[PDB]
Design a protein around this ligand. Structure first.
Ligand SMILES: *Cc1c(COP(=O)(O)O)cnc(C)c1O
Ligand SMILES: *Cc1c(COP(=O)(O)O)cnc(C)c1O
Ligand SMILES: O=P(O)(O)OC[C@H]1O[C@H](O)C[C@@H](O)[C@@H]1O
Ligand SMILES: O=P(O)(O)OC[C@H]1O[C@H](O)C[C@@H](O)[C@@H]1O
Lengths: 830, 830
């Protein structure tokens, strides 16, 4: 059937009775009333049963051996569905497929019922999920720590061409994967004040919110390692949240509990944009405060909570603990770790600081200013009084270091401060992270260099040793084996199965680049994938596409820097050329654009309306026929990504050079048989460098050209003046060609493009359509297109998150990865 | 070990492996980290496994045979713990005891970990729980319908002698008994307006709240019948509760969902007191609206949703459905049933009314005016516009009936109206229930008569056939076998086990009233029970009592009508007499008073403070020694009741004649070997009538005397003037003898007692202490005390809820009870 494992005789039988056990005992139903949803839960519980045995022994193991623990703090974990992925990593897919078949059910149909765990916005949240899978696969004693939001990223609905947001109640029917652990509930403090008494400061008169943990298993790939992802839930204490007496109402007091619990209710839907709301800041401290207590508790036990030197010496803390900051969101971990060590454990400042800097590491994800976390001091002052005091003290000592290193450089002092003066004083969280971490890293080589040359130049000059680079990557398991079994199978037919946990081996496919059978096969799976997607489209969304056309897709969050607008300009150009010479042949294309816009991002929502507007015109023009279709992929999410990427021919990674830190969707497309048209931005550079620029469609300005243009001054009018095709499009938008009933509907877009384009869209237009012509030319030659595809796939190995993690492990965390199978799952009950 | 069933070889082994299965697979723990709480859950899941098989077949059965269904609507279901009760009804107690023993655990210790299901206030809520058990035991196709509050009755804490309320988060660790059924979620409407168009009225522009059901199994006693208790939870739709667009905030919109969901958040802690809050009215419509849709859906299927006459003829509705109203709380079921039949199903008014009256029945629980539900019309007008219109129309037609029956009786017309004029117009819910129900019943013979003679006299004259009586009762399973296995065993040694489901057979114990061994045994179990309670007291609450003293206990909600105050006056009297003649012998007593006061009931909370105040003085007076102890039983609830009642010698049921409708605690004490000192009120009359007034300690005014006194005019000063002992007590309270630091602390109590005593406490004082002397005299003669106890126990059979239900079944519901074992639980999987 494929290498989805063995469909053993004993195990298919075992699976079936357990499926029935759960349907009866767990779901309390009987075959005559069970619905596809009940069937999905019976299977889910059956699959979950197979990894609890391994989960327990993996955790017990770490307790016995006591290795260095890796804590990955992130406010986002974009997990997606977990049924299939678990089957894959446990080599249970074929057996389950067989068993459910014999039970007379379609597994694929049941998989579609599982709700996505959308606890993320985009890149940052998905990176964290890929990292978790890789860390488990490399046998690291790693824990994912975050917030269990009851409402993840909103579900997007397109009404009248506009985006409509609606609550993502992903827990409505329950989550069979998580395991509530009320018994490990911890208290977290807010507000209050600071008392300076005799021997130390005291954080007093605080409001308490409880943090209840929920554990979700993270199985490695076929090695029997099952790590833990612990998500915190907010819970109100029963006392003061009732006991602070003297009139108010008993009923009201109970109803008001949903005020402390609102902390974990919803994820902020902002991608690469900072919103200084109090609720956000509370979420950030909540995950940090709770997580640290858990970290120290585990440390206090270790082998020190037995003997060792005997005296809670936190000198070994950094040797046993490593906490990674996914961006600046969990940055309060730095002052919080100090608060505990100094205030509670009573270590002297300097010893505490040494421990802190040595166990923390920060990962930066973007260079755009509006994405930078700068919290107003009045907010920190009110909510976390003691932490503000600690930050000021950290700032005081750090600046003194700078003054001593650069005597008389007074501007450098204000530039590097963690405290920013002005309208309102703010705390620069990124500066806090650099100072309290022993390693700071970019997510792609060019991004890492830009940090050193630009944004954090002063910091780099101060401590050059801190700055590193760790190019992102994706997990080959979910992003290849799981979403594209067809491609995975043909690859395995030639080079084996070891590449799933050793992607570098894909290089061996280079020697089949002229193989006639392989070329035919690679081309065949892509065709089958396109056919399956085209079908899904009519199935779930309804209104036909042509599977023979080139599948041009751009899927990612809607941003001005991602330039979905530049994609739009090309689409309109194609249309206009067809309308000019109707009876001329052009390569057919289905351009698919999908993504979510943050609710308050007006421009982004205006762009979604433009895309659908273009589609309304283009898709109903009889002269165009089936040569050009414009489709807006609704509710883009992980599960939707697993469907479109395998069916894509052209991947669009066209951000303005220097704005996309790395990107990961790009890598997803490369490994799945799509060719890339993009700019020399983020990881695109390392991808073209790995595949050879000849096998990539690079166009536009490089970083240097962008900067030259800024010195000069960017004037969009010039481009409008010298390019008639560009002019024609802008006047079409301005006159209502795309919005008849509301002719001035797109005035904001035109106004912006002509007068305040921060991402110089017009500047890359000419080179962009010229380059698009080149891809169309190559698509006309199937054999050569496929051969170039083989060159990309065979060369994408460097982009596996296993490689990224192995580097973090060795160069930051100080641990050694291991592909050693944990001693089976085998029963056992001590 | 006792007759807690057989401890079979095959079944004790089977239990143990399943206990381990769950500990591993369900709890995801391993013996080395499992805590008593984990052990309790493994056992709970193991026990729950044994009744799912029976649950499924019982329900499937009713679907096949299609008998008349009984729907018990109640806003309260005071369930308590369910582990032991399930073991008892499934004859699993000994096997579980054995198995857990072999696993090296104490079952009793694990039982104590289960949280009470406190979804009730007192009598009314517990009656509903006893009824559910009896209905299952008598094999009736009955369903309990209510609200799944996430916060039940508050947990009471005594601080400084004052009651402190704190949230009852009974779901914190989860509920292994319930089964969420998200797939049967229903929509419920609120607000909106009424549109009168061409063919009928339309309820329009309504706010929608979803009702999600949770099913809990209700096993009958050893007959393999497992009925269902369905509790509704409020859930916000994802749409409008987000989709009603045009600024407000996306985050805020999501946070605001906890506004529609506040409907099922907390139970109103009012016992026999009406609070006209909107939230309450919403809870009342919510349970009614959701439940009815479920009832009709099941009816539409029946055997009509196949064939029968063919044409949704609701003429057979009353033949297939019976809905019982537990008080007036679910009274909106009457107009709601009409709304559906008329507005949605389009039946003519008269046909709809006929169906409605014929399927509904109302149970009244009290005669005090402040407990009566009179909803302001402006509230119904805003929240349920169409229902108000229907009520007015029902009122119009009913009054016309009255006018036609009593021509010219204009006062009778205003007196009987469902609408009350005055300050604000209100809707008398009790009048609504009488008019739209075919049967109205009291809960005790005297209460039932009072309804006919007083409160509902006019209604009785109009339709004498509606009014009935159904004396309350309690379940012998939880209230004897479960809480007092020792007494149950010795009874079974003589007369067998058939009495557990046929309590009348207790009469056979009358022939052992002179049996020397029995007298010794009955006396022995009571001593063992007292010893176990005295221990529990020091264990969990700490500060000694003497097990040889008479255990004088009064446990029920704190009310002015229950007269805990009269109990207090006696306690102080005892104290004062001892202080007068210290070296005189008096029978030792431990008087225990326990109960919860509604948060806003100032007097009730003042009484709790008085009780603890008396204890502070009495319990620390060296001259008193161990002869007199005053203890306030904290957090009285079902689980606490199962501990004190079996250990009681004297039961206090001293309400003012004519105020306690029936009472049920009284019956609990009678069946458990306690003698009763009380007034001729509620069921007390039927109890003394059953045991013989000679075996009861009756004192005080009868109803007639109370009324004579009211004609005359009650003057408390008279009693104060003629009774020196009474005078001495009042002046002690007034001068601070019981409150040194705050001498005027109890001025409200004294003021009330002397000037506004609605329950004439002083009037029953003399006869009360005189009578208390008589019980002390009899306690001095162990043999005779025990013999009188045997007379009460042997004669309590009439007070089993099986008898009550059998009567409801035959005289109201029109169904026949059956003690037929359902065809085993046996596997099966169709
Ligand atoms: C991989 C992924 C992303 C990131 O895409 P980029 O093109 O790097 O912005 C965003 N959303 C989802 C659903 C993803 O799977
Ligand atoms: C039986 C019971 C009641 C009712 O007691 P009465 O004396 O009839 O008021 C109240 N609360 C609990 C805990 C009960 O078990
Ligand atoms: O003790 P910590 O590491 O917090 O948690 C360890 C626990 O993790 C998971 O919930 C699985 C469970 O078997 C294990 O006992
Ligand atoms: O169809 P209704 O009567 O609503 O519910 C019937 C269901 O009740 C319970 O949840 C047990 C389950 O086995 C049964 O199928």
């Amino acid at each position: 059937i494929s290498v989805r494992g063995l469909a053993g005789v004993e195990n298919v039988t075992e699976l079936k009775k357990n499926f029935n056990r759960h349907l009866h005992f767990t779901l309390v139903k009987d075959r005559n009333v069970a619905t596809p949803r009940d069937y999905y839960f019976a299977l889910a519980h059956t699959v979950r049963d197979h990894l609890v045995g391994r989960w327990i022994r993996t955790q017990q193991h770490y307790y016995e051996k006591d290795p260095k623990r890796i804590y990955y703090l992130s406010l986002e974990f974009y997990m997606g569905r977990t049924l299939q992925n678990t089957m894959v990593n446990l080599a249970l897919e074929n057996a389950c497929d067989e068993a459910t078949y014999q039970l007379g059910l379609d597994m694929e149909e049941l998989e579609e019922i599982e709700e996505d765990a959308g606890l993320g916005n985009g890149g940052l949240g998905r990176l964290a999920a890929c990292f978790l899978d890789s860390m488990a696969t490399l046998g690291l004693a790693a824990y994912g720590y975050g917030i269990r939001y009851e409402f993840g990223i909103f579900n997007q609905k397109i009404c009248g061409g506009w985006q409509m947001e609606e609550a993502d109640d992903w827990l409505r029917y329950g989550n069979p994967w998580e395991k509530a652990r009320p018994e490990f509930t911890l208290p977290v403090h807010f507000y209050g004040r600071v008392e300076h008494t005799s021997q130390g400061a005291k954080w007093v008169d605080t409001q308490v919110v409880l943090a209840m943990p929920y554990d979700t298993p993270v199985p490695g790939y076929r090695n029997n390692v099952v790590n833990t992802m612990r998500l915190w839930s907010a819970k109100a204490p029963n006392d003061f949240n009732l006991k602070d007496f003297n009139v108010g109402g008993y009923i009201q007091a109970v109803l008001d509990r949903n005020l402390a619990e609102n902390i974990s209710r919803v994820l902020y839907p902002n991608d690469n944009f900072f919103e200084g709301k109090e609720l956000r800041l509370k979420q950030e401290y909540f995950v940090v405060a709770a997580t640290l207590q858990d970290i120290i508790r585990r440390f206090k036990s270790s082998k020190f909570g037995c003997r060792d030197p005997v005296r809670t010496n936190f000198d070994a803390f950094p040797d046993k603990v490593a906490i990674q900051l996914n961006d600046t969101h969990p940055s309060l971990a730095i002052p919080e770790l100090m608060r505990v060590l100094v205030d509670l454990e009573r270590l002297d400042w300097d010893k505490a600081w040494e421990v802190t800097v040595k166990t923390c590491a920060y990962t930066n994800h973007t260079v755009i200013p509006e994405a930078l976390e700068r919290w107003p001091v009045h907010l920190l002052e009110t909510l976390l009084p003691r932490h503000l005091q600690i930050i000021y003290e950290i700032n005081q000592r750090f600046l003194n270091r700078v003054a001593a290193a650069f005597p008389g450089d007074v501007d450098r002092l204000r530039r590097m401060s963690l405290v920013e003066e002005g309208a309102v004083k703010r705390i620069n969280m990124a500066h806090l992270c650099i100072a309290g971490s022993h390693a700071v890293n970019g997510v792609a080589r060019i991004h890492s260099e830009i940090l050193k040359k630009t944004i954090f130049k002063d910091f780099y000059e101060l401590e050059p040793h801190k700055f590193q680079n760790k190019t992102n990557g994706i997990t080959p398991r979910r992003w290849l084996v799981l979403c594209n079994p067809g491609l995975a199978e043909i690859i395995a037919e030639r080079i084996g199965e070891e590449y799933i946990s050793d992607l570098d081996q894909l290089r061996k496919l280079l020697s089949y680049v002229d193989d006639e059978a392989f070329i035919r096969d690679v081309a065949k799976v892509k065709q089958e994938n396109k056919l399956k997607f085209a079908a899904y489209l009519e199935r779930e969304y309804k209104v036909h596409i042509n599977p023979n056309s080139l599948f041009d897709v751009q899927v990612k969050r809607i941003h001005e820097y991602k330039r979905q607008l530049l994609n739009c300009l090309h689409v309109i150009t194609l249309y206009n050329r067809i309308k000019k010479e109707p009876n001329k042949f052009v390569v057919p294309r289905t351009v698919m654009i999908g993504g979510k816009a943050a609710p308050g991002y007006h421009m982004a929502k205006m762009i979604i309306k433009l895309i659908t507007a273009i589609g309304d015109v283009v898709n109903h023009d009889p002269v165009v026929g089936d040569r050009l279709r414009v489709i807006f992929l609704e509710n883009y999410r992980v599960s939707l990504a697993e469907k479109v990427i395998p069916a894509a021919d052209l991947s669009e990674q066209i951000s303005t050079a220097g704005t996309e830190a790395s990107g990961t969707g790009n890598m997803k497309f490369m490994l799945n048989g799509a060719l890339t048209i993009g700019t020399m931005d983020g990881a695109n550079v390392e991808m073209a460098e790995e595949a050879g620029e000849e096998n990539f469609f690079i166009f536009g300005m490089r970083v240097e050209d962008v900067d030259r243009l800024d010195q000069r001054g960017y004037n969009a009018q010039e481009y409008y003046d010298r390019i008639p095709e560009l002019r024609q499009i802008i006047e079409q938008l301005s006159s209502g060609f795309f919005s008849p009933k509301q002719p001035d509907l797109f005035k904001d877009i035109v106004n912006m493009l002509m007068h305040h384009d921060r991402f110089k869209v017009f500047a890359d237009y000419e080179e962009y359509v010229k380059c698009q012509e080149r891809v169309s030319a190559l698509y006309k030659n199937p054999r050569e297109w496929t051969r170039m595809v083989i060159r990309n796939i065979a060369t994408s190995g460097k982009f596996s998150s296993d490689r990224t993690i192995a580097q973090y492990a060795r160069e930051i965390w100080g641990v050694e990865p291991s592909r050693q199978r944990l001693p089976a799952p085998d029963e056992k009950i001590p």
